[PDB]
Amino acid sequence: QTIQPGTGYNNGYFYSYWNDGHGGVTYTNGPGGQFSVNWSNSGNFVGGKGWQPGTKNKVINFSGSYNPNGNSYLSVYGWSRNPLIEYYIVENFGTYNPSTGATKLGEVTSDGSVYDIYRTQRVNQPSIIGTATFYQYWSVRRNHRSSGSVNTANHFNAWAQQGLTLGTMDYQIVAVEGYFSSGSASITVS
């Protein structure tokens, strides 16, 4: 069903939907691992389905339609605690590469494409444990796609060889983010 921001479990899967209150976004939980997002001149939002808690070796499958009209990205997104880390494995994006401004650490090959690895620090930003300071890790896919399989272990291992030691995994979802743009997406996670 179409819901206001929140989290929970729907049809077997954890979901998380958040927006900045701007308006212009409609998030709908669908059958099984499916979710749909339709936005028009939105603000900033992030929504998707997955697991809570996630794991360090989950192989995530996703398929569907991703039609961004401007600034937006499709990614595996999650958090870790001890250390507190917010991470993204970006599979596709619209007009803006979300890793812009981040520091490149290296590259990793996974699931048919090379990914560029980045990191950036966030000071006194909102997090799953409140206002805190933490790193953001990014794996950005060179060959964009809207369907496929992501072997998370390849990314966590690569990040570990670059100094990132993940601790306790919190949620882990396939999410669609929009940033003051328009678009539509219908993604199914499994």
Q: Residue ranges per domain, the chain?
A: 2-190
Residue ranges of the annotated binding site for substrate are: 73, 77, 88, 122, 126, 136, 171
Catalytic residue among 49, 80, 177, 186: 177
Residue 122 is encoded by which pair of tokens? 């966030």
Give yes or no: 86 in active site: yes
Q: Which of 148, 180, 184, 175 is nearest to 66 (CA)?
A: 184
Q: What is the resolution of this structure in A?
A: 1.5
Catalytic residue among 86, 91, 111, 116: 86
In the DSSP assignment, the letter for residue 55 is: -
In angstroms, the CA 42 to CA 25 distance is 6
In angstroms, the CA 57 to CA 151 distance is 7
Indicate which technique resolved this structure: X-ray
Element (H or E) spanning 94, and its range?
none
C-beta of residue 87 within 8 angstroms of C-beta of residue 78 = yes
In the DSSP assignment, the letter for residue 157 is: H
* 3-state secondary structure at position 155: helix
Residue ranges of the annotated binding site are: 73, 77, 88, 122, 126, 136, 171
* Omega within 30 of 0 (cis) for the link into 83: yes
Q: Which of 38, 50, 64, 65 is nearest to 10 (CA)?
A: 50
Residue 138 is encoded by which pair of tokens? 């990014």
Residue the block writes with tokens 């979901």: 15
The reply to whether CATH 2.60.120.180 applies to domain 2-190 is yes
Spell out the residues 6+ positions from residue 124 whose beta carbon is closer than 8 angstroms to its own. Answer: 131, 132, 133
Q: Which of 110, 114, 162 is nearest to 137 (CA)?
A: 162
Residue the block writes with tokens 């961004």: 68
Spell out the residues 6+ positions from residue 130 whose beta carbon is closer than 8 angstroms to its own. Answer: none
